[PDB]
Point group: D2
Chain length 247, copies 4
């Protein structure tokens, strides 16, 4: 129970990878405060799966791209729990299109949620962590941020951006004993991959030395490592969890 009584904030906790991160942290003893934006019922369900592990949990609506929402979100976290030991910046979206026809709003929305939202949530949690002289920030990037991917210029830019932001953050907060790292998932069995056709899946599997999509638990286990004392001398790093796709 390596996180017993820690307080973890998880953005995008209402479903997918974020829900499984919340549950995994709860399994290790962390109390959870997470957000949702468009899915209230999904948040109820995360909250019940988390509560089964005997920790305290609270959900709150917040759009991470909106500074006002992010400010109220962290204020309430601190009101409820007094501290934030772990922040997981997991909220993210895709709006895939060829660069040549990519719409300005497809660009803006992905940059604003994925990159700016991570900046906003980092900014809002920074003072509490600096006063605590302790904290872990885990940003959710993607291995395509490392290598590029046709049809995803906005997403790639946002995730490469997050990796750069992770480094600056790590440099700024390191003197107060705060670890800041990123996880870079490859292709994980999720709603994203559930929508794909056989030819597309086949070509994706061919890029993975292990020959299979990862699981949400693989990603949660990386976040857990980076949220715990087991990684206390690691900062400013991106951990790729991608079956060998990017070496």
């Amino acid at each position: 129970m390596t996180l017993q009584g820690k307080v973890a904030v998880v953005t995008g906790g209402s479903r997918g990878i974020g829900r499984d991160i919340a549950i995994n942290l709860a399994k290790e003893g962390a109390n959870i405060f997470f957000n949702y934006n468009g899915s209230p019922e999904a948040a109820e369900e995360t909250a019940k799966l988390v509560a089964e592990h005997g920790v305290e949990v609270e959900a709150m609506k917040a759009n991470v791209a909106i500074a006002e929402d992010v400010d109220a979100f962290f204020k309430q976290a601190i009101e409820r729990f007094g501290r934030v030991d772990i922040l997981v910046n997991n909220a993210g979206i895709t709006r895939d299109n060829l660069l040549m026809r990519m719409k300005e709003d497809e660009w803006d929305d992905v940059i604003n949620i994925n990159l700016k939202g991570t900046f906003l949530c980092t900014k809002a949690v920074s003072r509490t962590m600096m006063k605590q002289r302790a904290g872990k920030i885990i940003n959710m990037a993607s291995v395509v941020g490392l290598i590029g991917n046709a049809g995803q210029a906005n997403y790639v830019a946002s995730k490469a951006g997050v990796i750069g932001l992770t480094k600056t953050t790590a440099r700024e907060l390191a003197p107060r004993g705060i670890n800041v790292n990123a996880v870079a998932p490859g292709f994980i069995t999720t709603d994203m991959t559930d929508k794909l056709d056989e030819k597309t899946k086949e070509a994706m599997l061919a890029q993975i030395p292990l020959g299979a999509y990862g699981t949400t638990e693989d990603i949660a286990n990386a976040v857990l490592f980076l949220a715990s004392d087991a990684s206390k001398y690691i900062t400013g790093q991106t951990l790729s969890v991608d079956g060998g796709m990017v070496m």
Copy 2:
């Protein structure tokens, strides 16, 4: 005359590194189309220095963060020169602050000029280069995009973003023979640099000195020429050994 007959578009060409890029490309025979945003007098100085090399040059006012300005800019470039063979995305700004104190405006302005502007200009030039089945795009990043830097969350995010965008662009445009690369300057002597801050910066550079705008221009020229035709999706650090 490595670029004789070529047309190069340079964003941020009115001063500094962009001015020296434009002059260097002109010295190799390229006609230059470049933008300015708030410095018409500087733009006219650049134009004169470019024209001295025997090529044609035009400057046009445009904000690279604004989609409508970018569309008009590239429209006018094609009306003036008939084609675009080289795009150098050099326009960029900084609005430094500790991340805990960084204002939403400081974040947005830097992301929109440095990163969105590079996207918009790349998008604008892409169909033209695809039709030509030839082209070079050189994006200006920074070594702080590679390693991070305290006080520059926005700038670092934008430049690391540019590096990723460079790679996606290279992938999308490679089937039509277009090269797409990035140059990552370290500490370069300019008006902006010329404290104890300087001595601490020098201690980070194995060569022991700031670089010159000509060093950066020379990297850009290499990546814009036939000498680098099998190079794509790469970032070239021009930093005196600061980041290895």
Copy 3:
């Protein structure tokens, strides 16, 4: 105990970081097989510390640069314990000098122990792991393998080489479900660290964002992560444990 019943081979396990890796893996329930050279005294101390955790342990004399020694070492590991679940390639030496002054034997000795030793041990364990359709290899590199270091051309080349070899190995063994990763330590405390001049310590700590040397437990914890189910979708990676020295 997350490695209950596993067998770990740790090269260089008789002292320093190697010893602390062997002890950490023993505390998670792994039986330990390790090599030594010269006097058995350090090896005797390691075996004692390991056995206090209630697992089985055997030391064997073997020089990792020597093919014959390696062959016999792995044969005896199989004879003694049945299988090899984890291999930690930690054997390593330095012979520092500026390039101008570096002797040919100083070059060869370091390349042979650090790089060739990793190759020979990897080769020796590979058929066993392939047959098992399971296994973890963790190679010990160094952050100077990533960025270079004056006076260490041989050491740097060897550890950079080890990082490349890690990637080839991961590629060749991925189809049998074997994970292969590297750990890159930064500046880690030894019992001489405290004795250094203040000027010396300050110049080293200036290069580290976290502002302190790491511990051998920090390194052992990263190895443990990479030897466990928690990292089963991670392969071909180098994990830097360096307080942010290299980002």
Copy 4:
């Protein structure tokens, strides 16, 4: 003529990429001193092609894995041309095999030539370059040194090692203004379907492409670049 009056030493100059590096440097006005090991007839052909550009050229037998050969090679280079301005460490071999079947000799031969050879030549040229307070060293790596490649554990280890060595050399020699960099070729056409699929540009590169990257890193055009690896691989590794 960017390199008029310069003296370039090229290892592995008798064939393939090294031959074209030598020619390209000559084209820019450099005198050329290069080695061969097993191919004197190919070395004569290289020398004739270099001599077309009006520069002086000499070939000399040397195994870069042998310290005595390397010392004599560099000694003769200095005797012949007075100085060395540029060193290109291009000699290299492959001896492929799956890790589990790879022989100790296949490992040793590739490490000794590709990595130890680059160390030995770098060591030999370093004193004269330091005394000059000028020089350029370009090492030949490979993109598989960056990402790994099944069947090539020896080659990959050797080239990844060269990249690390490049960084150390760059740091040790930067105080006297010597630039040290590496070129990492992808698939280059030398003397199919699956290789091409991995290259975004959709074609193998040419020896001229590699030669042009070497020339850039050997010239004043790159004087602020050191400790870098330039991948010339049609986008294979980004």
